[PDB]
Write a protein that binds this ligand. Sequence first.
Ligand code: CLA
Ligand code: CLA
Ligand code: CLA
Ligand code: CLA
Ligand SMILES: CC1=C(/C=C/C(C)=C/C=C/C(C)=C/C=C/C=C(C)/C=C/C=C(C)/C=C/C2=C(C)CCCC2(C)C)C(C)(C)CCC1
Ligand SMILES: CC1=C(/C=C/C(C)=C/C=C/C(C)=C/C=C/C=C(C)/C=C/C=C(C)/C=C/C2=C(C)CCCC2(C)C)C(C)(C)CCC1
Ligand SMILES: CC1=C(/C=C/C(C)=C/C=C/C(C)=C/C=C/C=C(C)/C=C/C=C(C)/C=C/C2=C(C)CCCC2(C)C)C(C)(C)CCC1
Ligand SMILES: CC1=C(/C=C/C(C)=C/C=C/C(C)=C/C=C/C=C(C)/C=C/C=C(C)/C=C/C2=C(C)CCCC2(C)C)C(C)(C)CCC1
Ligand SMILES: CCCCCCCCCCCCO[C@@H]1O[C@H](CO)[C@@H](O[C@H]2O[C@H](CO)[C@@H](O)[C@H](O)[C@H]2O)[C@H](O)[C@H]1O
Ligand SMILES: CCCCCCCCCCCCO[C@@H]1O[C@H](CO)[C@@H](O[C@H]2O[C@H](CO)[C@@H](O)[C@H](O)[C@H]2O)[C@H](O)[C@H]1O
Ligand SMILES: [Ca+2]
Ligand SMILES: [Cl-]
Ligand SMILES: [Fe+2]
Lengths: 62, 65, 108, 446, 29, 324, 34, 37, 33, 30
Amino acid sequence: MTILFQLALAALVILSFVMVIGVPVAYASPQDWDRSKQLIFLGSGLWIALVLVVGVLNFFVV
Amino acid sequence: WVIHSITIPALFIAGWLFVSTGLAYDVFGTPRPDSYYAQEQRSIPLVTDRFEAKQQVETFLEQLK
Amino acid sequence: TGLTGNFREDTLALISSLREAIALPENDPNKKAAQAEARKKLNDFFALYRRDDSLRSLSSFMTMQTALNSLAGHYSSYPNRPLPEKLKARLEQEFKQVELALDREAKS
Amino acid sequence: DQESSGFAWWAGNARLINLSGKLLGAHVAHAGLIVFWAGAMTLFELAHFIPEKPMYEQGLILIPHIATLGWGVGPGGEVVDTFPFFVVGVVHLISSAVLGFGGVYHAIRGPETLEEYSSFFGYDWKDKNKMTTILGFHLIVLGIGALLLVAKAMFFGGLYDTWAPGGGDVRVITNPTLDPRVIFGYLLKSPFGGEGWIVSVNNLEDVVGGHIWIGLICIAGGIWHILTTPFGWARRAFIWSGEAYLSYSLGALSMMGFIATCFVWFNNTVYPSEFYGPTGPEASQAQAMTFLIRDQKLGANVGSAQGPTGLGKYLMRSPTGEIIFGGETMRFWDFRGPWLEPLRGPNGLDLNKIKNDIQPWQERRAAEYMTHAPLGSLNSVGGVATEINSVNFVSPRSWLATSHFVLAFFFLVGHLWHAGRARAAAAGFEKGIDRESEPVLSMPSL
Amino acid sequence: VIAQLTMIAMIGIAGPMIIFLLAVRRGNL
Amino acid sequence: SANLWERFCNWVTSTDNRLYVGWFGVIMIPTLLAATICFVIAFIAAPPVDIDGIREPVSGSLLYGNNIITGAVVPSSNAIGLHFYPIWEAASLDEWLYNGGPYQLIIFHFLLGASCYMGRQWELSYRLGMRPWICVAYSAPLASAFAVFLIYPIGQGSFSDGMPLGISGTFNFMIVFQAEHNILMHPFHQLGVAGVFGGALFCAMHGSLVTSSLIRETTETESANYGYKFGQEEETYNIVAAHGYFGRLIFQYASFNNSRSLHFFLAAWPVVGVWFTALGISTMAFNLNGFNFNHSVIDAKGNVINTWADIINRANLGMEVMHE
Amino acid sequence: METLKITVYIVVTFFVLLFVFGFLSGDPARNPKR
Amino acid sequence: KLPEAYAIFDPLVDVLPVIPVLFLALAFVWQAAVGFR
Amino acid sequence: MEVNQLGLIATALFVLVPSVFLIILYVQTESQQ
Amino acid sequence: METITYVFIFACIIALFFFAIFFREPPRIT
Ligand code: CLA
Ligand code: CLA
Ligand code: CLA
Ligand code: CLA
Ligand SMILES: CC1=C(/C=C/C(C)=C/C=C/C(C)=C/C=C/C=C(C)/C=C/C=C(C)/C=C/C2=C(C)CCCC2(C)C)C(C)(C)CCC1
Ligand SMILES: CC1=C(/C=C/C(C)=C/C=C/C(C)=C/C=C/C=C(C)/C=C/C=C(C)/C=C/C2=C(C)CCCC2(C)C)C(C)(C)CCC1
Ligand SMILES: CC1=C(/C=C/C(C)=C/C=C/C(C)=C/C=C/C=C(C)/C=C/C=C(C)/C=C/C2=C(C)CCCC2(C)C)C(C)(C)CCC1
Ligand SMILES: CC1=C(/C=C/C(C)=C/C=C/C(C)=C/C=C/C=C(C)/C=C/C=C(C)/C=C/C2=C(C)CCCC2(C)C)C(C)(C)CCC1
Ligand SMILES: CCCCCCCCCCCCO[C@@H]1O[C@H](CO)[C@@H](O[C@H]2O[C@H](CO)[C@@H](O)[C@H](O)[C@H]2O)[C@H](O)[C@H]1O
Ligand SMILES: CCCCCCCCCCCCO[C@@H]1O[C@H](CO)[C@@H](O[C@H]2O[C@H](CO)[C@@H](O)[C@H](O)[C@H]2O)[C@H](O)[C@H]1O
Ligand SMILES: [Ca+2]
Ligand SMILES: [Cl-]
Ligand SMILES: [Fe+2]
């Protein structure tokens, strides 16, 4: 089912590559930087889990 | 920013064609990628003497295979 | 291995395994595994002696290296096939010279 | 930010001298790059990688390193399973994702100065104590990894072997050599011809036993510095100040380069000629033997002979008791490679033995090093230097030594740069000579 | 190699995005 | 005084000397003075140093029929290889000369002398109270020194391939060096040329434009130079006059209003130009060569249209056979 | 020959020894300003 | 070569390593908007 | 070895005459005042 | 003959150096 995974694999980059933009911009304008944005704690804690799906699955997948 | 969306494109395409058309070949007399050695006879079509070359270049080029 | 002490006694000792293990039955329960663990000693063996600069000069040590490199080098390429007899009968003749020539060093 | 408090933009980084909060942001981010670059090349190379052919054929500057620690190599340099190679690179990437993220955090939202948020982390460049405290921890940590190498050496798997009784590949060291006799006294050897300084390292087990010391020396270093404080003679010299620290780092880092330039180019032990490609000295060396055997094979005896140049066709007798190859190769009679040394007899090569003792791998491999003798171009036009458009390569062994050298060269300049600006800064006139009172203006006039 | 530049453009142009948006919304640059 | 040392130390450091000897001078002076003495002698009387013991002895000495042009100190042989080969290690004195000792002796004391010099310029500048970057600028030659003398032979594993030091020896070196590594087509050298010319170039303009503009303190009969009084706090040369000059000659935008901006750029161009060469050599010493475009052109018939670089590729291929 | 060997050692050792202490003793203290 | 579960990301695996250089370039653009303050 | 027989005079005159001509002018200048 | 001229010419160079370094008239200020 590597295709099922491979879509989830690319879903890492897609979500990462935006957080690549989002995190700095979150710090760009200090107004409501840490005030308005908890999305880091919302995205990051969800982002780290998107790493574990990679290997542990592929170890069984491939 | 007025005609500089016009001049450049129409002009730059000209240079694109003279290569593509190969018009530059017979204009500047460069050899064509297949044209060096007519027949086989591998040797330098070296132009030699004066008051000739206009006629002599027209021997080397005459064969052309 | 279990190599200890000086080079001499152990050098002789390893030949007791080397010259023996050359020709055994292939159809025994394990010749390979026996030949496997026996040649692993070479690894253990010839690593520590590579470190000696002294014996790196004289023949009798570099003789053994010629033997070791001859024998073991077969086992990375295709260890399954047994050696050619010409390579097997050309060894002992090296060992036979060695321990004599080896003894030639001490009592020179 | 701006130049008003500071200096100009093109140099603008050194605006950070007094801001530590920003300073960590720099390094952690920068370290993030280095890590990220590491894994990138790994995957980049792994995609274009061909496991069947040799490594140096591939133009491969990294996987050999990972392999050299004995992962996925197999005997024969087989390069068995690539998956360990894959795991290494990707992990560094994921590691970088954390780093730069932090590097950004200190770059912006992190406090602009650390003297407050954490006094422990707080430091002043001019302070000769709390800084030296830091120098301990790294020197401890950097000493940990050195041991952590040996953890690979003595325990987990085993490191790659240059010299095995055959195949020259994989061994787990049992007894590392340690004592000041062959270690401290080791570096005491001459740098020059025939004795490498650190570049000899005949035995593998030298480095392991050696790193043990560097392992246990550095751990002392931290414990030394953590529990100590600079002495008088230290304080009188060294110009404690923000720049100089960077200046010293360069000089050390520079001289490291020239050393690293030296290993890759010469030492066969650490970098196996097998998958790093043959060393320059070995190249012409092995080629000289393949000519030897091919002619000795067929109806010719080259042992006692003269050449058109007069030295003999192949073999000569050195001023030393050992006998060597002729030709240009004679300039390298010092080289001892994994294949050559056994062919060598007590004094020099044993000719009678040379004919008989050839192996299936040796002759093949020794001839395989004939095609690749380090040479090539920037567009990779290869073959012998003026050989025309055949066998196009540049052996990776040649790249590193070139690369790191050029960099190592600059860092000499860099060292010699900042050391100027560091001391002059401390001396106070770095800002330009003072027009009010010129130091030269009033002096005894010669 | 048909999409080599495709993805490259995506990431290559992504860098400027940071500078663009920041400058656009006039953030602490 | 209060002590001999503390007084002596004060004398070395002291600036009153007609020649400043810093602590680097403690190495520099004896080594160079030892290099020169063992040089000029060895240059004048050198036994016919042998490069290859196979028997061609080479006489680069001055006593044997050699003009300054042809005379040079032969480098060490290949038989000696790269081994450290001091006097005492060699068996006999004449043995130490016949194998090319004096070469290996000079370059060590020279280099190790050249380095300490690079610092001696520094530790004076520090004691006159002046911004000390000269030692950076001086790295450029010293880079080249180590490159051609010390480094490049390491790439060859023998000092024989090192530069024979002499006016003909040097020419022999390049040409042979050109044979193997094709240095001309190498980019780093191709910058070094720019680095040298633009140095010489700028050396002319910045030399010219300021001489062009001289506030005149002199009569026409009198020399123009003498009007400058050592220690004038007047500006001897108009920038406003010379600015517009170069500013009119080409467009006014590029004229480099600021001398402090100019003179730096004046000293950056040659230096950085030279560093690349000493990198270009070290890139060669490891056999990483200049890209030689060869058979870049071919017809459909497999014939070789034979672009220029091949001519060079042949000439080099010509030389290498000649050398051996 | 052999006597020369030790001689060069002694002489070279001397300068280099004389050399380091110059910096190891108060070198920055020697300068126009502080 | 590249694992089969991962078999295709062509451009990404083709160019990772160039982007580190791009950071140096970014610095100038990030100076360009700032404009050499 | 064999040589241009007269080539030596070349150097001498080329050394001395330009040299001397600089001295004579100089010694004069020294006498000024 | 041949050589002995070069050493002579080269000698006066040195005899100029040592001579030109120490014996130059100091260019005093003002
Ligand atoms: C260990 C690394 C290191 C570190 C951390 C520093 C740190 C510092 N250096 Mg520095 N330096 C170093 C090594 C280092 N140096 C070395 C090795 C040299 C010799 C080359 C120098 C030479 C140097 C000078 C001359 C100056 C500094 C300056 C500075 C300060 C500001 C940084 C700066 O100017 O960025 C500036 C960043 C840029 C100008 C952008 C980079 C542009 C260059 C040209 C990149 C070209 C490299 C590239 C590979 C070639 C082109 C690519 C090719 C494909 C075409 C800062 C304290 C400045 C200062 O005054 O210090 C207080 C300063 O003027 N450094
Ligand atoms: C590559 C190494 C490097 C690093 C780590 C830094 C880091 C820094 N520089 Mg700098 N600099 C560099 C190279 C570097 N520089 C070079 C080469 C030059 C010469 C061209 C300069 C010239 C320079 C000047 C002239 C100045 C700095 C300054 C600074 C500091 C503040 C910059 C700032 O306000 O950011 C703000 C950044 C933004 C608003 C946007 C940046 C774009 C974001 C960060 C991209 C995110 C990266 C990536 C895509 C995402 C990764 C995270 C992801 C995992 C989520 C910061 C610590 C300033 C200073 O003195 O410090 C206070 C300053 O005045 N730098
Ligand atoms: C990279 C790590 C590192 C760094 C930066 C420092 C830095 C420092 N240490 Mg130190 N130290 C370290 C590791 C380190 N140490 C380790 C691992 C140990 C072993 C436990 C020590 C043990 C130690 C002691 C015992 C002392 C220091 C001291 C010092 C301070 C001044 C002395 C000094 O640096 O010597 C600079 C060097 C010299 C003065 C003389 C140089 C002589 C060298 C060794 C020549 C060796 C021969 C060489 C091979 C010749 C080759 C020629 C060359 C061109 C290659 C300084 C802050 C002193 C201090 O202030 O502590 C209170 C001190 O007393 N250190
Ligand atoms: C390439 C030559 C060179 C030159 C000209 C300089 C120049 C300078 N260095 Mg230096 N340095 C160099 C290479 C060089 N460095 C290298 C390779 C290292 C190794 C890390 C260092 C490490 C270093 C430190 C640690 C310090 C300096 C410092 C300095 C400054 C003067 C103080 C001093 O005595 O220097 C030190 C001089 C040396 C270490 C001598 C090495 C090179 C010289 C030219 C050779 C001298 C003879 C040498 C020992 C070999 C002969 C005997 C040998 C056969 C055993 C000055 C800017 C000081 C400074 O500015 O701090 C702010 C300072 O504290 N240097
Ligand atoms: C199997 C696999 C996988 C998985 C893996 C994983 C699981 C990963 C891991 C990774 C890791 C494991 C990571 C983590 C993180 C880490 C980091 C990156 C860290 C760093 C940090 C730091 C370092 C900090 C700093 C500091 C501070 C702040 C304080 C104190 C001191 C210190 C220094 C510590 C993957 C996906 C790859 C794919 C392939 C296969
Ligand atoms: C701050 C700043 C700066 C700097 C920057 C930096 C330094 C950055 C860094 C960055 C970095 C250092 C980054 C890192 C990160 C990472 C990431 C983001 C990653 C991603 C990727 C991944 C996640 C992977 C994935 C995968 C897998 C897992 C498997 C296979 C496939 C793939 C490969 C896809 C500058 C100077 C410019 C400017 C100013 C500010
Ligand atoms: C052996 C070996 C090893 C180990 C390692 C080691 C043991 C090393 C050590 C090394 C070292 C441990 C080095 C040292 C050197 C020295 C030096 C390079 C340092 C630096 C410093 C100095 C040089 C100082 C400076 C100065 C002077 C000179 C004068 C006065 C001033 C001052 C103080 C600044 C291994 C395993 C790898 C491998 C095998 C072999
Ligand atoms: C995709 C991807 C990613 C991301 C990446 C990144 C984020 C990167 C960045 C990048 C960058 C970082 C970029 C930058 C940009 C740049 C550019 C776009 C360039 C251009 C250039 C320019 C524009 C320059 C300018 C100039 C000129 C032109 C001339 C004059 C001078 C100057 C310098 C001004 C990751 C990791 C997640 C992984 C996956 C995939
Ligand atoms: C500027 C200052 C001038 C200083 C000049 C010092 C000159 C000293 C002369 C010493 C004697 C040399 O005198 C000269 O010796 C040379 C060779 O050496 C002899 O020369 C003879 O042999 C040489 C061999 O090289 C032939 O080239 C030459 O044609 C032949 O005449 C001359 O017959 C003699 O005239
Ligand atoms: C600070 C510098 C110190 C320099 C130290 C050396 C100073 C010595 C100066 C005099 C040396 C000139 O050396 C002398 O040159 C003359 C040139 O005619 C050579 O003489 C030459 O002509 C004669 C005449 O037949 C030949 O015999 C001889 O073989 C030939 O070389 C001498 O063989 C050589 O001894
Ligand atoms: Ca491709
Ligand atoms: Cl088989
Ligand atoms: Fe000038």
